[PDB]
Design a protein around this nucleic acid. Structure first.
Ligand SMILES: Nc1ncnc2c1ncn2[C@@H]1O[C@H](COP(=O)(O)OP(=O)(O)O)[C@@H](O)[C@H]1O
Ligand code: ALF
Ligand SMILES: [K+]
Ligand SMILES: [K+]
Ligand SMILES: [K+]
Ligand SMILES: [Mg+2]
Length: 501
DNA sequence: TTTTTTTGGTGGTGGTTGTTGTGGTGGTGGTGGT
């Protein structure tokens, strides 16, 4: 049901142009990108379109992965020549760069000039091809009135992308969307945001946002919550978890790394994104933070169903997807776990095991011949035999393709490197974090019809604008600590947008 | 104040980094593995 404007951008891409297209929050940029990818893939081949964004959550929104994950450059910090050498070792990433025909990059506002220039070097060098990006077709999408790249604060609204040599030679074409969809119900709200987008906040606009400080309805819809800093986010996530009914399950990380200063180690540990102490409950909302396979990536959203050991989960999964599931099969595995292990492997202590929440057996429930749910009492027995085995969270993850894949999530390992690649710090922990609340950075690209926003710690230009334009309706938005002095837009972006009509 | 991540050969400034190689479609490495 794409608009006249959206379809012409898709059709322009068919003609082979290297395009950047843009528009205010909620103009339908990502919804259009999703559809565009199908036709680029039909032109180039299923495996030959790189779909990428600046953050994990924004990449998942269009079925892709982070530009960093795609390129194979790690953090991509060093000289272009060093990154290229890292890339050319890894067979997956070198072949990817040689074979792809198109590179899709969403939320481009968060990509700094150095990365584009280095990426240009990499594509030119790998493909033996002096075209702007080795000839890869470029589709760039985002809004530079939103967040700039993440940096600290020497003198760094880091030169944005439009200042990169790679950009000026590569980007052939720009397209601007104008119609705001996200907030379409509320024209006064849309006008307030777009002027807020440009850093032009008047008194009357300020009055209306300060009016939205009233609390949200206590209704069963759990709100999204947005904060500037990870510390704010963790407090909001842990609060919501404590309101959930249920026994807490504690997962303490295993940390290491061959550095003598314990404090220095902890500084490096903070940026691993998986918590030291992961607390989960049945019903907890979680986010995947590691790239495990093709459709389970950083940004995948899920809900904890229960906690089971691998033997129990094999039975749970098979009971799911059952032709009719004669309860005899479950019984064989119950009294003879040696047969469960073989069955499981054919396809490949002092703490009481709490029984499974009855909600996890609801899928079979939606005539006493078939209402004999002995399997529920059979599944509970098999689970009880897991006393003294590790019980992992079963999470229903939802991918960008609308699939609802159930995964019993095992611990993974993280490591960082040096100027070269010696590991400084390493951790083993589940690749999960609570995700009712989101940082404003990772929220960028999301649509949040019920959201609380606390602007108390906003610092970068455009951050306040990003947070409020996630909302759909004013009735579903609360804003705390709005301050107009913290919303001024970057003049370089105002100027750049002047060559656009 | 915030984001970004890692198998194999089209490296060798390292095995303390290989259950990540119980490898070999690599050689400007050798405290690793056969
Ligand atoms: N043509 C359209 N018709 C109806 N709704 C749309 C259309 N385009 C976008 N939307 C809605 O607008 C919201 C934001 O769109 P999105 O593609 O995320 O914009 P952006 O990526 O620019 O923020 C989505 O929830 C989507 O449902
Ligand atoms: F610019 Al957006 F969601 F991608 F507001
Ligand atoms: K090696
Ligand atoms: K060797
Ligand atoms: K080797
Ligand atoms: Mg988008």
């Amino acid at each position: 049901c794409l608009s006249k404007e959206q379809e012409s951008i898709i059709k322009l891409a068919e003609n082979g142009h290297n395009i950047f297209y843009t528009g205010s929050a909620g103009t339908g940029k990502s919804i259009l990108l999703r559809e565009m990818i199908k036709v680029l893939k039909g032109i180039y081949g299923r495996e030959n379109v790189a779909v990428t964004a600046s953050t994990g959550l924004a990449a998942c929104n269009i079925g892709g992965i982070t530009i960093h994950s795609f390129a194979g450059i790690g953090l991509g910090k060093g000289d272009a020549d060093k990154l290229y050498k890292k890339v050319r070792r890894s067979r997956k990433h070198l072949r990817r760069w040689e074979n792809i025909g198109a590179l899709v990059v969403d939320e481009i506002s968060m990509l700094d000039a150095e990365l584009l220039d280095k990426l240009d070097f990499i594509a030119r060098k790998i493909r033996k091809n002096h075209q702007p990006f080795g000839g890869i077709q470029l589709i760039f999408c985002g809004d530079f009135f939103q967040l700039p790249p993440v940096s600290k604060d020497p003198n760094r609204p880091t030169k944005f992308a439009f200042e990169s040599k790679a950009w000026k030679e590569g980007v052939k074409m720009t397209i601007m969307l104008q119609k705001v969809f996200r907030q379409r119900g509320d024209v006064k709200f849309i006008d307030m945001l777009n002027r807020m987008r440009l850093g032009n906040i008047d008194d009357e606009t300020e009055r209306e946002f300060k009016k939205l400080s009233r609390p949200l309805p206590d209704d069963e819809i759990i709100p999204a919550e947005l904060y500037s800093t990870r510390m704010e986010v963790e407090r909001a996530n842990n609060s919501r978890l404590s309101k959930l009914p249920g026994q807490v399950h504690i997962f303490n990380a295993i940390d290491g790394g061959a550095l003598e200063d314990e404090e220095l180690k902890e500084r490096l540990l903070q940026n691993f994104l998986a918590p030291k102490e992961l607390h989960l409950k049945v019903g907890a909302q979680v986010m995947m933070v590691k790239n495990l396979d093709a459709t389970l990536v950083n940004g995948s959203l899920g809900k904890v169903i229960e906690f089971m050991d691998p033997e129990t989960y094999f039975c749970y999964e098979a009971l799911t997807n059952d032709p009719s599931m004669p309860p005899e099969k479950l019984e064989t595995w119950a009294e003879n776990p040696s047969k469960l292990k073989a069955a499981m492997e054919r396809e490949q202590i002092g703490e009481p095991v709490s029984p499974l929440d009855s909600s996890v057996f609801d899928f079979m429930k939606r005539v006493v011949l078939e209402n004999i749910k002995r399997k529920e009492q059979l599944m509970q027995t098999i689970h009880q035999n897991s006393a003294g085995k590790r019980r992992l969270p079963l999470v229903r993850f939802k991918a960008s393709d609308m699939s609802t894949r159930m995964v019993l999530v095992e611990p993974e390992d993280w490591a960082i490197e040096d100027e070269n690649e010696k590991p400084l710090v390493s951790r083993v922990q589940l690749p999960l974090m609570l995700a009712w609340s989101l940082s404003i950075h990772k929220s960028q690209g999301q649509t949040l019809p019920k959201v609380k926003v606390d602007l108390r710690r906003v610092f970068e230009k455009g951050q306040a604008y990003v947070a409020l334009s996630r909302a759909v309706s004013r009735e579903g938005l609360q804003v705390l600590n709005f301050d107009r002095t913290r919303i001024k837009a970057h003049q370089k972006v105002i100027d750049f947008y002047l060559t656009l009509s």
